[PDB]
Amino acid sequence: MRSSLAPGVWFFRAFSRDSWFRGLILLLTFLIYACYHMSRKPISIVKSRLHQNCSEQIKPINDTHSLNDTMWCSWAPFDKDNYKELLGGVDNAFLIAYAIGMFISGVFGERLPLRYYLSAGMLLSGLFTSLFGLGYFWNIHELWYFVVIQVCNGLVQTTGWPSVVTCVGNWFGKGKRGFIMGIWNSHTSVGNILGSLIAGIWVNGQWGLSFIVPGIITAVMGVITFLFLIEHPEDVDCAPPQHHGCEEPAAISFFGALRIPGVVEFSLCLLFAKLVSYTFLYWLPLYIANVAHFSAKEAGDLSTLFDVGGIIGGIVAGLVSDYTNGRATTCCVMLILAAPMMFLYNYIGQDGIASSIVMLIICGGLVNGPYALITTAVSADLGTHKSLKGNAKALSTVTAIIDGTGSIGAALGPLLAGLISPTGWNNVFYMLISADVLACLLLCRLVYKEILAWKVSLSRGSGYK
Amino acid sequence: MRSSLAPGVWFFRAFSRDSWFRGLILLLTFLIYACYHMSRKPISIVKSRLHQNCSEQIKPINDTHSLNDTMWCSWAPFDKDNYKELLGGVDNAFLIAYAIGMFISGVFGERLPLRYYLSAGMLLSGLFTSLFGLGYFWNIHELWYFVVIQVCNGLVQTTGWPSVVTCVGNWFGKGKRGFIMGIWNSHTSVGNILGSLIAGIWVNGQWGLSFIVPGIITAVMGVITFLFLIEHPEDVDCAPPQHHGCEEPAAISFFGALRIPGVVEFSLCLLFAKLVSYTFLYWLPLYIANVAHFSAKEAGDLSTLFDVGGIIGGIVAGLVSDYTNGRATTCCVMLILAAPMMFLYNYIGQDGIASSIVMLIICGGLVNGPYALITTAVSADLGTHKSLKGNAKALSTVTAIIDGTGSIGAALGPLLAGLISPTGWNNVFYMLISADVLACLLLCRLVYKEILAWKVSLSRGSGYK
């Protein structure tokens, strides 16, 4: 008898129509690239079952031949003395192929529709992931099966990142990108944790089923993204974005994307800033079990907080980057301050667990912050750059160049972390601080431009345009 | 480069605006009354723990006094020889109060807003449910606590059914109500199964936590329904329903709702048709463990299929009722055919399990079908009846009369099933077939009207209006 509209459908009423289509994509691409990080994780959990030292795990009585020195419990290509080498090659053939084949998935992204391209990539990314664990049921014992599958999976997994940031760059304007994409980047941690939680169920058991369920969830999301993806904001005919400046512009040439004046320096900064976050997280279990002496459990517990620091730092850097209008001055002051604070972690970290939480969150903040900021905000900034003057379309080629040079660092991670490791386990810690000066020195020209632009903005005294 | 709108957002585009608001309510009220059936179930599972015969469950050594004849394991008001009586009174004080207090919740429903009334009912329905299990932690041992809480819970649980069918009767027109509400009525089985699955976790353990979690889920849904409920289709200003015939009409008087020419006969049919579905499902474990000799497990397994038969029969009756335009001729031919088929279950049911599945699904179809059809479709039909001529509003008073007389049958169920039970366990089976002739004879006038109306519709030979 008294209508008085309900507070929920009065709150949901206030949002405009083309402010719902922005909320859909920013959710949908949150689930698409959280399923790419789910299918990469099951080879770093089942690393510890394909060798399986038989000190524990007592023997069911079937064979008593030659005492079975780590060949009873093990999988047959990975059973002898060379298992760190043979399991190194399998994990290395993915990292080489994903970094070489990323540059091609940029120039295929702008020449194909992003719903027929991002949804064939997910089906093949589920298939080649699931064949790895399907090799358990077929009882396959050969190196060149598990190598070739990881090669094809590394070539297929690269259709994901040039398409997702293109979809979330066609919608959102220049207004807030450090805050919204900083909030948004928690999918690369949600995916790692939900991969570590799913693939670890069927390990210590039927390990070939650790690969099939994350391969099937990706192929189901690859058909949900075929049905509900709108790549341009003019397809539903609501509103073009806040990008200032019938037919569609022709895509850029690959040599033209290196001409945009900030790509090949942010690129070489990201190559050297991914290597820091690799070799610190490599050096850390060498520091726990040799100096600190905490446990064997805490080494996998502190690596989670080193990532939680990253999703705090990615939004703090984004807020400062938006409200101050400098994107390479934030990435320099966030990388300068990590070297004295990692020396401080080296000097304080011998103490209890109360000092190993207030340091690792800050370390993940200062190290995984510029990675997120460079890989999304300045990557969707330089794609829609003003020098293209509207008569070009280069948004998937720049975000392929920057991330495919950032993946050369992850590919050169374990090739150098295994080289100087026999000469002393405290010798990678100099590679850390060398790369944290290289990554800072590759931004000095950008920082000089950002400071020089403030003199013609602040000395004018609230001037004209 | 080729837009070609996605099949999902092209399918979701075709549905009109006021065909989404119909889909919301028909979902939202599906979850509101599935949470009323979740909080009724935990006293029929923890019936078997408050006595707990100590033949099994061996003794932890604390006391060796007087051999502890069913007082060691038990809860202290329900430990002596009279436990079927003391646990009968607790389960009977709910059934008396829910059936006496239903008639008042009709005349409070039309005089109050259905969002400030259906959302205080759910908060108090969570509170008085949760106090029952909170009496375990407070260590309460008195009969007149567990009795008075069930009295107040029976008076509070009755705000749910006159409001839900009023909300789904204000939106949907006369076009399809047997099919849509027949699909919709599966909440009274989903709620029973999800109550039986939640409350059975913490039984054989801390039983006072079997009542708190279904009490909290109801109080959370009672604040979701405060935020998202639209009770009139003119509140969002889309479209009034297909109900033929500023201010709102005044509600009807309680003596006026008995003047509508079909209420007090469908009412007395439902009183006698709920008692059949009670005493058959009471007689069935007396038939398993005395004649058929299947197991002690199957007696709780066949009672689920007797309900699955109901949600098949409720949509079959609804389709025949819509496409033939007779609502009391379906309810008579569905109640006539159950008596020879229950004699057939008595004569065939001695055989294996292959004959106890094709009979119990049909029995639940022929018995729980007219219950669903009468309790929703003819109950939302006679509320919007043509004799009110628009200048009245009687939709929650009729659906309170019909269901509050159908609950007198559930209240008189265990008062008569315990009376003639010591005179022979095959004596309730005559009460079955007596009530299945009473429930059929209380519809003969309606069936005569439905047949008589076909002569002035079919002999006209495609006549005028």
From Swiss-Prot, chains A, B:
Activation/inhibition comment: Inhibited by vanadate but not by chlorogenic acid.
Keyword Iron (UniProt): no
Function noted in UniProt: Inorganic phosphate and glucose-6-phosphate antiporter. May transport cytoplasmic glucose-6-phosphate into the lumen of the endoplasmic reticulum and translocate inorganic phosphate into the opposite direction. Independent of a lumenal glucose-6-phosphatase. May not play a role in homeostatic regulation of blood glucose levels.
Tissues and organs where the protein is expressed, per its UniProt entry: Detected in intestine and pancreas. Lower expression is also detected in liver and kidney.
UniProt KW keywords: Antiport, Endoplasmic reticulum, Glycoprotein, Membrane, Sugar transport, Transmembrane, Transmembrane helix, Transport
SUPFAM superfamilies recorded: MFS general substrate transporter
Transmembrane segments: 19-39, 88-108, 118-138, 145-165, 189-209, 210-230, 268-288, 300-320, 328-348, 357-377, 400-420, 428-448
Protein name: Glucose-6-phosphate exchanger SLC37A2
One GO process term, biological-process aspect: glucose-6-phosphate transport
Carbohydrate-modified residues: N53, N62, N68
Superkingdom to which the source organism belongs: Eukaryota
Membrane topology of this protein: Multi-pass membrane protein
Catalytic activity: D-glucose 6-phosphate(in) + phosphate(out) = D-glucose 6-phosphate(out) + phosphate(in)
Family: Belongs to the major facilitator superfamily. Organophosphate:Pi antiporter (OPA) (TC 2.A.1.4) family.
Species assigned in the record: Homo sapiens (Human)
First-listed, main subcellular location of the protein, grouped into a coarse class: endoplasmic reticulum
Locations listed in the record: Endoplasmic reticulum membrane
InterPro entries: MFS, MFS_dom, MFS_trans_sf, SLC37A1_2, Sugar_P_transporter
A GO cellular component annotation in the UniProt record: endoplasmic reticulum membrane
CDD domains in UniProt: MFS_SLC37A1_2
UniProt entry tagged with the keyword Nucleotide-binding: no
GO MF annotation: an example: glucose 6-phosphate:phosphate antiporter activity
